[PDB]
UniProtKB/Swiss-Prot annotation, chain A:
Transmembrane segments: none annotated. Belongs to the fungal fatty acid synthetase subunit beta family. Present with 91800 molecules/cell in log phase SD medium. The gene is FAS1. It comes from Saccharomyces cerevisiae (strain ATCC 204508 / S288c) (Baker's yeast). [Alpha(6)beta(6)] hexamers of two multifunctional subunits (alpha and beta). This is Fatty acid synthase subunit beta. Fatty acid synthetase catalyzes the formation of long-chain fatty acids from acetyl-CoA, malonyl-CoA and NADPH. The beta subunit contains domains for: [acyl-carrier-protein] acetyltransferase and malonyltransferase, S-acyl fatty acid synthase thioesterase, enoyl-[acyl-carrier-protein] reductase, and 3-hydroxypalmitoyl-[acyl-carrier-protein] dehydratase.
Curated annotation (Swiss-Prot), chain C:
Present with 17000 molecules/cell in log phase SD medium. Transmembrane segments: none annotated. Fatty acid synthetase catalyzes the formation of long-chain fatty acids from acetyl-CoA, malonyl-CoA and NADPH. The alpha subunit contains domains for: acyl carrier protein, 3-oxoacyl-[acyl-carrier-protein] reductase, and 3-oxoacyl-[acyl-carrier-protein] synthase. This subunit coordinates the binding of the six beta subunits to the enzyme complex. Belongs to the thiolase-like superfamily. Fungal fatty acid synthetase subunit alpha family. Signal peptide: none annotated. This is Fatty acid synthase subunit alpha. It comes from Saccharomyces cerevisiae (strain ATCC 204508 / S288c). [Alpha(6)beta(6)] hexamers of two multifunctional subunits (alpha and beta). The lineage of its organism: Eukaryota, Fungi, Dikarya, Ascomycota, Saccharomycotina. 4'-phosphopantetheine is transferred from CoA to a specific serine of the Acyl carrier domain by the C-terminal PPT domain. This modification is essential for activity because fatty acids are bound in thioester linkage to the sulfhydryl of the prosthetic group. It comes from the Eukaryota.
Length: 131, 49, 48
Protein backbone atom coordinates (compact mmCIF):
# COMPACT_ATOMS: atom_id res chain seq x y z
CA UNK A 1 0.00 0.00 0.00
CA UNK A 2 1.35 3.38 -1.25
CA UNK A 3 2.16 5.88 1.60
CA UNK A 4 0.18 9.18 1.34
CA UNK A 5 1.59 11.82 -1.15
CA UNK A 6 4.96 12.93 0.37
CA UNK A 7 7.29 15.98 0.00
CA UNK A 8 10.84 15.93 1.51
CA UNK A 9 12.10 19.45 2.48
CA UNK A 10 15.83 19.89 3.38
CA UNK A 11 16.73 22.64 5.95
CA UNK A 12 19.52 25.15 5.01
CA UNK A 13 22.13 26.85 7.29
CA UNK A 14 21.53 28.33 10.80
CA UNK A 15 20.16 25.20 12.56
CA UNK A 16 23.69 23.55 12.95
CA UNK A 17 24.60 22.31 16.52
CA UNK A 18 27.54 20.40 18.13
CA UNK A 19 26.81 16.60 18.12
CA UNK A 20 24.30 16.87 15.18
CA UNK A 21 23.22 13.43 13.80
CA UNK A 22 25.98 11.64 15.82
CA UNK A 23 23.05 9.70 17.45
CA UNK A 24 22.41 8.14 13.98
CA UNK A 25 26.20 7.65 13.40
CA UNK A 26 26.30 5.27 16.49
CA UNK A 27 23.35 3.11 15.30
CA UNK A 28 22.82 3.30 11.48
CA UNK A 29 25.02 1.27 9.06
CA UNK A 30 23.74 3.58 6.23
CA UNK A 31 24.57 6.83 8.15
CA UNK A 32 28.05 5.47 9.19
CA UNK A 33 28.80 4.83 5.45
CA UNK A 34 27.99 8.54 4.66
CA UNK A 35 30.11 10.27 7.36
CA UNK A 36 33.03 7.72 7.17
CA UNK A 37 33.02 8.08 3.34
CA UNK A 38 33.17 11.95 3.56
CA UNK A 39 35.54 12.13 6.60
CA UNK A 40 38.07 9.99 4.58
CA UNK A 41 37.69 12.34 1.58
CA UNK A 42 38.32 15.44 3.79
CA UNK A 43 41.19 13.79 5.75
CA UNK A 44 43.08 13.01 2.47
CA UNK A 45 42.35 16.10 0.26
CA UNK A 46 42.17 18.95 2.87
CA UNK A 47 43.81 17.52 6.00
CA UNK A 48 40.89 17.74 8.52
CA UNK A 49 38.15 15.36 9.82
CA UNK A 50 34.62 16.86 9.39
CA UNK A 51 33.51 14.35 12.16
CA UNK A 52 35.94 15.89 14.75
CA UNK A 53 34.60 19.39 13.78
CA UNK A 54 30.91 18.28 14.24
CA UNK A 55 31.56 16.12 17.41
CA UNK A 56 33.75 18.62 19.40
CA UNK A 57 33.44 22.27 18.19
CA UNK A 58 37.17 23.17 17.95
CA UNK A 59 37.77 26.99 18.32
CA UNK A 60 41.01 26.84 16.22
CA UNK A 61 42.07 24.17 13.64
CA UNK A 62 45.64 24.04 12.14
CA UNK A 63 46.36 21.94 9.03
CA UNK A 64 50.07 20.99 8.66
CA UNK A 65 51.69 20.37 5.23
CA UNK A 66 54.62 18.11 6.36
CA UNK A 67 55.77 14.90 4.65
CA UNK A 68 54.78 13.92 1.07
CA UNK A 69 51.06 13.42 1.97
CA UNK A 70 51.07 16.96 3.48
CA UNK A 71 52.60 18.59 0.28
CA UNK A 72 49.74 17.01 -1.73
CA UNK A 73 47.22 18.48 0.75
CA UNK A 74 48.85 21.95 0.35
CA UNK A 75 48.53 21.87 -3.52
CA UNK A 76 44.77 21.23 -2.85
CA UNK A 77 44.46 24.63 -1.00
CA UNK A 78 46.76 26.49 -3.50
CA UNK A 79 44.62 25.29 -6.51
CA UNK A 80 41.36 26.68 -4.92
CA UNK A 81 40.72 30.02 -6.79
CA UNK A 82 37.70 32.41 -7.11
CA UNK A 83 37.35 33.23 -10.93
CA UNK A 84 35.26 36.41 -10.14
CA UNK A 85 33.70 38.35 -13.19
CA UNK A 86 34.44 41.76 -11.33
CA UNK A 87 35.42 44.58 -13.83
CA UNK A 88 35.04 44.33 -17.69
CA UNK A 89 37.73 41.53 -17.60
CA UNK A 90 37.31 38.58 -15.10
CA UNK A 91 39.85 38.71 -12.16
CA UNK A 92 40.92 35.44 -10.28
CA UNK A 93 41.38 36.12 -6.51
CA UNK A 94 43.15 32.92 -5.24
CA UNK A 95 41.47 31.78 -1.89
CA UNK A 96 44.05 31.20 0.91
CA UNK A 97 46.57 33.93 -0.11
CA UNK A 98 48.61 32.96 3.05
CA UNK A 99 49.42 29.54 1.39
CA UNK A 100 52.48 29.29 -0.93
CA UNK A 101 55.28 26.74 -1.76
CA UNK A 102 56.94 27.71 1.61
CA UNK A 103 53.91 27.16 3.97
CA UNK A 104 53.98 24.34 6.58
CA UNK A 105 50.64 25.22 8.31
CA UNK A 106 47.34 27.06 7.74
CA UNK A 107 45.03 27.88 10.71
CA UNK A 108 41.18 28.30 10.59
CA UNK A 109 40.19 30.88 13.28
CA UNK A 110 36.70 31.16 14.75
CA UNK A 111 35.46 33.11 17.82
CA UNK A 112 32.88 30.59 19.20
CA UNK A 113 33.46 27.28 17.29
CA UNK A 114 34.45 26.24 13.69
CA UNK A 115 31.06 24.49 13.23
CA UNK A 116 29.57 28.10 13.04
CA UNK A 117 32.01 29.07 10.15
CA UNK A 118 30.29 28.83 6.71
CA UNK A 119 32.82 26.33 5.15
CA UNK A 120 32.46 23.71 7.94
CA UNK A 121 28.71 24.28 8.67
CA UNK A 122 27.79 23.80 4.97
CA UNK A 123 29.17 20.17 4.84
CA UNK A 124 28.16 19.19 8.45
CA UNK A 125 24.48 20.10 7.51
CA UNK A 126 24.61 18.51 4.01
CA UNK A 127 26.00 15.22 5.54
CA UNK A 128 23.71 15.12 8.67
CA UNK A 129 20.80 15.29 6.14
CA UNK A 130 22.19 12.88 3.48
CA UNK A 131 22.77 10.43 6.44
CA UNK B 1 84.17 21.22 20.36
CA UNK B 2 86.33 23.27 22.78
CA UNK B 3 84.33 22.80 26.08
CA UNK B 4 84.72 26.29 27.66
CA UNK B 5 87.40 29.05 27.06
CA UNK B 6 89.40 27.72 30.12
CA UNK B 7 91.76 24.63 30.45
CA UNK B 8 89.90 21.42 29.41
CA UNK B 9 92.47 18.51 29.11
CA UNK B 10 91.27 18.33 25.45
CA UNK B 11 91.53 22.20 24.87
CA UNK B 12 95.35 22.62 25.36
CA UNK B 13 95.97 20.50 22.15
CA UNK B 14 93.18 21.98 19.91
CA UNK B 15 95.86 24.47 18.61
CA UNK B 16 98.05 21.42 17.75
CA UNK B 17 95.41 19.47 15.72
CA UNK B 18 94.55 22.73 13.78
CA UNK B 19 98.19 22.74 12.41
CA UNK B 20 97.24 19.49 10.50
CA UNK B 21 94.86 21.75 8.41
CA UNK B 22 91.71 20.75 10.36
CA UNK B 23 89.14 22.80 12.33
CA UNK B 24 87.91 22.69 15.91
CA UNK B 25 84.86 24.69 17.03
CA UNK B 26 83.67 26.89 19.87
CA UNK B 27 80.28 25.72 21.24
CA UNK B 28 78.70 28.88 19.59
CA UNK B 29 80.02 27.64 16.18
CA UNK B 30 78.87 24.01 16.84
CA UNK B 31 75.50 25.52 17.89
CA UNK B 32 75.34 27.54 14.64
CA UNK B 33 76.14 24.36 12.63
CA UNK B 34 73.30 22.29 14.27
CA UNK B 35 70.73 25.21 14.03
CA UNK B 36 71.44 25.00 10.26
CA UNK B 37 69.85 21.45 10.38
CA UNK B 38 66.58 23.11 11.55
CA UNK B 39 66.41 25.53 8.57
CA UNK B 40 63.36 24.88 6.32
CA UNK B 41 65.53 23.36 3.43
CA UNK B 42 67.20 20.52 5.44
CA UNK B 43 63.85 20.10 7.30
CA UNK B 44 62.20 19.62 3.84
CA UNK B 45 65.11 17.17 3.03
CA UNK B 46 64.93 15.05 6.30
CA UNK B 47 61.24 14.44 5.35
CA UNK B 48 62.33 12.71 2.07
CA UNK B 49 65.35 10.57 3.22
CA UNK C 1 82.57 7.92 31.67
CA UNK C 2 86.39 8.23 31.63
CA UNK C 3 89.13 5.68 32.43
CA UNK C 4 86.57 2.88 31.89
CA UNK C 5 88.27 0.31 29.61
CA UNK C 6 86.45 -2.93 28.61
CA UNK C 7 87.62 -4.79 31.79
CA UNK C 8 85.94 -1.97 33.89
CA UNK C 9 82.50 -1.78 32.16
CA UNK C 10 80.11 -1.93 35.16
CA UNK C 11 76.87 -0.26 36.41
CA UNK C 12 77.79 3.36 35.50
CA UNK C 13 78.46 2.35 31.83
CA UNK C 14 75.31 0.10 31.76
CA UNK C 15 73.30 3.09 33.08
CA UNK C 16 74.91 5.60 30.73
CA UNK C 17 74.05 3.18 27.83
CA UNK C 18 70.36 3.59 28.78
CA UNK C 19 70.52 7.45 28.90
CA UNK C 20 72.45 7.76 25.60
CA UNK C 21 70.63 4.98 23.60
CA UNK C 22 67.78 2.71 24.87
CA UNK C 23 65.85 5.62 26.52
CA UNK C 24 66.51 7.85 23.43
CA UNK C 25 64.72 5.12 21.42
CA UNK C 26 61.97 4.94 24.12
CA UNK C 27 61.51 8.80 23.95
CA UNK C 28 61.17 8.68 20.06
CA UNK C 29 58.97 5.62 20.54
CA UNK C 30 56.72 7.64 22.90
CA UNK C 31 56.29 10.65 20.54
CA UNK C 32 55.23 8.21 17.73
CA UNK C 33 52.55 6.78 20.11
CA UNK C 34 51.23 10.28 21.18
CA UNK C 35 51.29 11.52 17.52
CA UNK C 36 49.48 8.39 16.23
CA UNK C 37 46.85 8.47 19.01
CA UNK C 38 45.73 11.89 17.57
CA UNK C 39 46.07 10.82 13.87
CA UNK C 40 48.86 13.41 13.34
CA UNK C 41 50.49 12.14 10.08
CA UNK C 42 51.66 15.46 8.46
CA UNK C 43 53.56 17.20 11.35
CA UNK C 44 56.67 15.05 11.88
CA UNK C 45 59.43 15.69 14.50
CA UNK C 46 63.03 16.04 13.29
CA UNK C 47 65.17 13.96 15.68
CA UNK C 48 68.72 15.55 15.75
Amino acid sequence: IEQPVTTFVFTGQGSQEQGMGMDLYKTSKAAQDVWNRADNHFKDTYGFSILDIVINNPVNLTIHFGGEKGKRIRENYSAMIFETIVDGKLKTEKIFKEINEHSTSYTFRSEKGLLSATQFTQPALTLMEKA
Amino acid sequence: TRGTGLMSANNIIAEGIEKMGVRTFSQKEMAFNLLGLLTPEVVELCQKS
Amino acid sequence: EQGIELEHIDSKSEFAHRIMLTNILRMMGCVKKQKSARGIETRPAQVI
